[PDB]
UniProtKB/Swiss-Prot annotation:
Residues shown, of full length: 61 to 249 of 724
Swiss-Prot/TrEMBL keywords: Cell membrane, Cell projection, Cytoplasm, Lipoprotein, Membrane, Palmitate, Phosphoprotein, Repeat, SH3 domain, Synapse, Ubl conjugation
Record bears the keyword Repeat: yes
Keyword Transport set for record: no
Name recorded for this polypeptide: Disks large homolog 4
Length: 194
């Protein structure tokens, strides 16, 4: 569900008008060495054009491939890009989702899964959503067999997890006993084996 767009900007007196973070030497989100837009400077070229967005990823600058380069190499690619700069960016489209309620019994071994995300620890650029990253084999979640990696936890019991800090999500998952209702979001589109 990735969306690509070529954005052509005319360099101005104050530059192109945006800030970047990332590079093979300083992953903006750990591991991923992509060059991300972190800010759109008001009044600048990027802002006036209106197409560039925070969390957009710059894959190419004119003919230069910056998908896997050092931060400095990207800054230089941009500084040397001339007056008319063609930015080829990528931004993710949120997949179609279907809500599902999963009831787990919390035993001594706990819920048996790991999560990532939340404000202050986003799992995907832009995305404050709480995601399942791991499901312990033989664990409660596993035994039930419904919860899957990539699933979004929208709520725990009556507690919503939209736009919350990572710590608050963890607290919501821990403030539980016996019966636990996980409201989850799974990708709508699916195929069935016949």
């Amino acid at each position: 569900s990735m969306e690509y767009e070529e954005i052509t900007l005319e360099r101005g007196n104050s530059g192109l008008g945006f800030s970047i973070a990332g590079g093979t030497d300083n992953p903006h989100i750990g591991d991923d060495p992509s060059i991300f837009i972190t800010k759109i400077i008001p009044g600048g070229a990027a802002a006036q054009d209106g197409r560039l967005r925070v969390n957009d990823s710059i894959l190419f600058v004119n003919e230069v491939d910056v998908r896997e380069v050092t931060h400095s190499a990207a800054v230089e690619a941009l500084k040397e890009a001339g007056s008319i700069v063609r930015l080829y960016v990528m931004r993710r489209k949120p997949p179609a989702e279907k809500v599902m309620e999963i009831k787990l019994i919390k035993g001594p071994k706990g819920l048996g899964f790991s999560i990532a995300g939340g404000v202050g620890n986003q799992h995907i650029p832009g995305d404050n959503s709480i995601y399942v990253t791991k499901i312990i084999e033989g664990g409660a979640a596993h035994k039930d067999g419904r919860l899957q990696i990539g699933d979004k936890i929208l709520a725990v019991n009556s507690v919503g997890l939209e736009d919350v800090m990572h710590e608050d999500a963890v607290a919501a998952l821990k403030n539980t006993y016996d019966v636990v209702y996980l409201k989850v979001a799974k990708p709508s589109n699916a195929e069935t084996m016949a």
